[PDB]
Amino acid sequence: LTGLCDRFRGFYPVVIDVETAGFNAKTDALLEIAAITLKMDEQGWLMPDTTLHFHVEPFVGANLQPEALAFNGIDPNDPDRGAVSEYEALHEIFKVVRKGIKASGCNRAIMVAHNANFDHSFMMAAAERASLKRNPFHPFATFDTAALAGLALGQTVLSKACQTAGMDFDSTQAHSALYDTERTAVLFCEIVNRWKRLGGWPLSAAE
DNA sequence: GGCCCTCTTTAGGGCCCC
Ligand SMILES: [Mg+2]
Ligand SMILES: [Mg+2]
């Protein structure tokens, strides 16, 4: 291929997972976020690059759903969380992403996530509140690993997709931002690498 | 949390992005 900028029409894939206090991106709090950039080796194989992870303070006036907190087991009132503002978390992620875009020769970043619209809507909403400028992510395009796993593995559930792909998946570590992002990143890389392995990529190898 | 299905309506379990 072999360069990352040539693989997805100049899009720089960044794996994202968020933990929230509900399903409403407009009103519910962002509590946690992890980001994993990708890279290709000289042979053209995809693999994780830089990993970021932040605990996030609920923005002022945010709604908190008890059922959501019960699911992710996150206590926003814990002073020992080490949480930062949405601004600080996303500002650092954007900085690393813009740096990755520049070095790779890509044009823009695209979010890779499982059921990606969820994570995308929450990140865009948080960027709006924090008044962040020059959002390096595509405003509506995403790489949904649920759809990709549907094609590649015939499974749409993250746990099952990883297992089907022959990956390790610990249910005791599941539903945590860093672990979910890492497993999603490996899943996405495996799907992409498998397609190359089967001769589906490059298009000349599609033959 | 709330919609969906059915071995349903005097119910609960699946869903599986929180
Ligand atoms: Mg998730
Ligand atoms: Mg998660």
Numbering used by the authors: 7 to 213
Paper text:
RNase T is a member of the DnaQ-like 3′–5′ exonucleases with a DEDDh domain that contains four acidic DEDD residues (D23, E25, D125, and D186) for binding of two magnesium ions, and one histidine residue (H181) for functioning as the general base in the active site for the hydrolysis of the 3′-terminal phosphodiester bond of a nucleic acid chain. RNase T can digest both DNA and RNA and it has a unique specificity that its exonuclease activity is reduced by a single 3′-terminal C or completely abolished by a dinucleotide 3′-terminal CC in digesting either DNA or RNA, referred to as the C effect. To determine the molecular function of RNase T, we show here by biochemical and structural approaches that it is a structure-specific DNase capable of digesting intermediate structured DNA during DNA repair. RNase T has an ideal dimeric architecture for binding and processing the 3′ end of various structured DNA in diverse ways, including duplex, bulge/bubble, and Y-structured DNA.
To reveal how RNase T binds and processes a DNA bulge with a blunt end, we co-crystallized RNase T with two bulge DNA molecules, one with a 3′-end TC and one with a 3′-end CC sequence in acidic conditions, pH 5.5 and pH 6.0, respectively. Therefore, due to the low pH, the bulge DNA in the crystal were not cleaved by RNase T. The crystal structure of the two complexes was solved by X-ray diffraction methods at a resolution of 1.8 and 2.0 Å, respectively. In the RNase T–bulge DNA complex structures, the dimeric RNase T bound to two bulge DNAs, with the 3′ end of DNA binding at the active site of each protomer. However, in contrast to the previous duplex DNA complex, the aromatic side chain of Phe29 was inserted into the bulge and stacked with the two neighboring GC base pairs in both of the bulge DNA complexes. The crystal structure of the bulge DNA complex revealed how RNase T can overcome the double-strand effect by inserting Phe29 into the bulge so that the 3′-end scissile phosphate was moved accordingly into the active site. We found that the active site of the bulge DNA complex indeed had an active conformation with two bound Mg2+ ions, and the general base His181 was located close to the scissile phosphate. The crystal structure of the bulge DNA complex also revealed how RNase T could overcome the C effect. The 3′-end cytosine was paired with the 5′-end guanine, and this base pairing prevented Glu73 from interacting with the 3′-end C to induce the C effect. Therefore, the bulge DNA could be processed by RNase T without any sequence preference. Moreover, the 5′ end of bulge DNA was not hindered by any residue and could further extend, suggesting that RNase T can cleave bulge DNA with a long single-stranded region at the opposite strand, similar to those DNA in the frameshift DNA mutations (see Discussion).
